[model samples]
Target: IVGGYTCGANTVPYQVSLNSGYHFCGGSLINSQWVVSAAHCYKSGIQVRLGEDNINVVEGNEQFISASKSIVHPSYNSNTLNNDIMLIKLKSAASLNSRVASISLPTSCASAGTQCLISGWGNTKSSGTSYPDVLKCLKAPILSDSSCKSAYPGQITSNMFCAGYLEGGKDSCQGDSGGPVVCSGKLQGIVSWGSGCAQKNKPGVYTKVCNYVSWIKQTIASN
Candidate 1:
């Protein structure tokens, strides 16, 4: 996040770290046993950590679980970044409590200019911005598909949407892919890809969650 800061104690309980040995991506707990992430992040040995803020070290609030299976969307395109979403089933359901719980899914689509929050363990270069090891929270404004089409051209497809600042400040960076974009207290988007973290006129791209709500439910139920 460009102008973000460390999250408050127990703020984003549903936030989870996606680790391939170490933290690489972020995700949201949509249910006790199901985690939603970006399909582009699919890989072997991927795992999930629940209710943790600082992922670098294990804490009492943290619960680590091995991934039992990865369900990538059938139409996922690595090159075009289309249909970039996935579901990871935990070996066992999470023990939900005050520090861990599931985030609700949106009942309808999010409108443009809707202010939302994105929390993640993303990165910041030597030119490091506020976001870091401890979970960071930042506010981002949702943008219209037309805005994305103009900024990113052919890359913005029906399955994708854009958020963040067009002026080079505020955005989800590396190490934060597959994370949650919460709007109206619901999971609205998944941090999928971006053009050079926090670049001008290149807002962060996300998998439009509303477009995949039914698919998400079907995948979770049938799996």
Candidate 2:
């Protein structure tokens, strides 16, 4: 599915392709050098498509980058779905422009009650099974640390953050993982998981970008 972006009344989005016809979740470009996405989105052979909106069947003069290497958190557990963060190193750097711009990453700002934006080509209705070809976006406020801790208990660690509607019908769904959670125009988090695609009372969990800044810098520098 595509990563959605809005420019006044006009909207644009991008998508990721796994094969000729299959698509995976969306993601955001952090810089010319790095891409931030969910660890669960990492696949053996995958290509990232940028600068396009129609996810199902549209091709633009977009650039395709091969993931030469990936760095997933060592503590990540697919079963428990903990520490679900990752960085992808492109074989070649992306050519940037207004249409294919990079989102800024938060250097500091990891507190409670922050507001963020989430975008994707996920299911429109809570229980709808299909993802729309057109990308869409909505806002979600970051849960206060105490509130999140109370909701997830011991599972909500310092490394993670929570964002979504507490009522939960308007949240990220199945194909929205790996996308950015933007706050103050900065990349603050990456989509990880939820109880189900868009169930009520089940806010979406995300990898706190501020928590892994050192690791991300080191990994990107080494690459």
Candidate 3:
């Protein structure tokens, strides 16, 4: 979370950390038994940690659960990174509490200029690895799809969107994939990719959650 600061304890309860001995990607609890993240972060045996604040210390409120299954978008394209979303069915349903919960899906698509929250344990630097021990969050406005298209030219799809300061500073970086970019208190985006962390003209790109509402609901019901 480049250009972002630490989030208050239990403030982002729906946040999930994809851990394989250590934090790798961020995720969001969408339901008692399911989590939503980036498809690119998929890896078997990765444990999901919820109600996390600081990764270096033990917080009694934390809940670690193994994944029962992972479902990546069938049409996801790795090369261009289109439809980069994934759902993880937890091995057991998470107990909802003050420090652990699920977030509501988007009520509608966020238009350009909508200020959203991006939270994660991703790298703090643009170049090297500087993952934070505590979760961090940034408030950035959603950029127009046309603006995103101009920034990545032929790469931005309806399934993807961008948010951040175009002049530079404030973006999600490595180890932040599959995290949340929430708007209006609803789950809005999944940390996907970017040219660089907080670089000029290169805002953080995310999996547009609003476009996948039907898919998410149908998938969870069918499986």
Candidate 4:
């Protein structure tokens, strides 16, 4: 139970396994069959581990969901981090349990000032190292469309959602991209970008989940 600001008793965080090693981050289970994350986190030899406090230790039979297919947004460009959302199809559906539960997706745009929560194994501070085993959580308020656009200026796009502290010092950092930005117990965004981890005037950006609802439904339906 590593708590800083974003996560409390309501949410849980997971990590993805990459070829190099495990990267601490957060993810949301969209359905029994799929999990949503950021495209930048996509890589070969990636595996999602759920229901655990320590990301480094497999305490029990943590749900080791294998990603059979990865569908990144067609407009996604790793260089610019545009259209950064992606879906991971699990080889099999996960059994709902105390340690494992699926999150719902927002069907429409969330209202401004909606209090959302974000969690990950990202750094506690901008200049600090990422947390290895402990899951860290933070809280952010969803910004109005106008405010979000103004905050990021030309960088904020329709496909993105903005959330984080205006004063800074608490936000998702490197290795935390593609994580979940949950609100009202629903996944509203996927971690995408920020000027720097927890920096003022640079709120974290995420993929607007509502904007791609159709794509997600169609993709899941096709599979």
- Highest lDDT against the true fold, candidate: 3
TM-score of 4: 0.88
Colliding pairs, model 2: none
Q: Give the Å shift of residue 191 in candidate 3.
A: 0.5
Q: Which portions of model 4 miss their true places by more than 4 Å?
A: 1-20
Off by over 4 Å in 2: 1-20, 59-61
> TM-scores, in order shown?
0.95, 0.87, 0.98, 0.88
| Best-fitting candidate, scored by TM-score | 3
Worst 10 residues of 4 by lDDT: 1-10
Q: Which ten residues in a row have the lowest lDDT in candidate 1?
A: 124-133
- Cα lDDT of model 4 overall? 0.72
Query: Relative to the unseen true structure, what is the C-alpha lDDT of residue 198 in candidate 1, on a scale of 0 to 100?
Result: 79
Query: Which tens-of-lDDT digit does each residue in 1-223 have in candidate 2?
Result: 1223432211432223322235676777877756778888878776777765566655664677777777788888887777788887777888877667788767896566778778766666565476676557777789887767766777787778888767656677777788778888888888787777556566778888887778878878887
Candidate 4 shows a clash count of 8
On the 0 to 100 scale, the lDDT of residue 31 in model 3 is 91
Worst 10 residues of 3 by lDDT: 126-135
- By TM-score rank, best first, the candidates go 3, 1, 4, 2
lDDT per residue as tens, model 4, 86-146 = 8888888877675677777777788889988777767666775645455667777887778
Task: Give the local distance difference test score of model 3.
Answer: 0.91
Model 3 off-target regions past 4 Å? none
